[PDB]
Subunit: 89 residues, 4 copies
């Protein structure tokens, strides 16, 4: 080959090989950013679900405390009822 022909071929080859390398880097980086976004999404979902669990628990305890209060005041009303039902004879 001519000196000018081998020059031009080298330039073509390097230009095409550069582009291959760049594409592969883009692929690696897309895969990594997608991996990382998924990991972060799962973390974010768990954090949310734990917050909702914690709020369910607090609502449950509050509802049960309120039921306990109803039973207590019932006990106190059966009490006074019974104390008035006891005659002096």
């Amino acid at each position: 080959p001519t000196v000018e022909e081998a020059k031009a071929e080298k330039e073509t080859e390097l230009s095409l090989q550069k582009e291959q390398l760049q594409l592969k880097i883009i692929e690696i980086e897309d895969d990594v950013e997608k991996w990382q976004k998924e990991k972060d999404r799962i973390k974010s979902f768990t954090t949310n679900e734990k917050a909702i669990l914690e709020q369910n628990f607090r609502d449950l305890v509050r509802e049960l405390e309120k039921q306990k209060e109803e039973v207590r005041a019932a006990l106190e009303q059966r009490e006074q009822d019974a104390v008035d039902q006891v005659k002096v004879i």
Copy 2:
């Protein structure tokens, strides 16, 4: 009647009437002490039942808190499981 006969009769009558009065007082007082002991017993029962209620409530809350903890650690294990299941491709 002789003076000595009316004397002796008065003494008999007063002695028998005193005894009637005393018996009635004993009856009134028995009824009152029994009334009061019953009132006190019912109060004492209610106090006991409320204490047992309060301890049931505390055991229930403790058991539910412990269940919440199991669900939370389950959520965290499905989490790490899932984070390891996400490939880098």
Copy 3:
């Protein structure tokens, strides 16, 4: 005394004595109603103060739970801070 004079005197005496008896009953009943109203007022005050105590306790626990949450999230921020401060060298 004349029959008509003793009649009239008896009526005066009974009328004045009735009024004495009635006044004493009114006094007994005033004292009893006042006793009972005071007892009821003290009971009512205690019931109120216990309710306010119970609400103070609940506000205190809620405030402390909220402070615990701040300390926990502080611990988690010193954590991530520290994990990023550890070099790969």
Copy 4:
């Protein structure tokens, strides 16, 4: 150089260069394992401190609940004391 001399030199050079490469890999891997062990240690410390926080909180609440109970029973004793201090006159 002799064919046998260039052979022997190539072998020396490759052997020394291999060893350089291996050492660098060992260094990279030591740094990475140390990084990772430190990250894990900090995580492990935070987890511990949060557990101790959580147990302090529970002991605090239990102590305060117990103090509330003392104040309540004090209120009830000033109550009965006062109810007995109210005369019938």
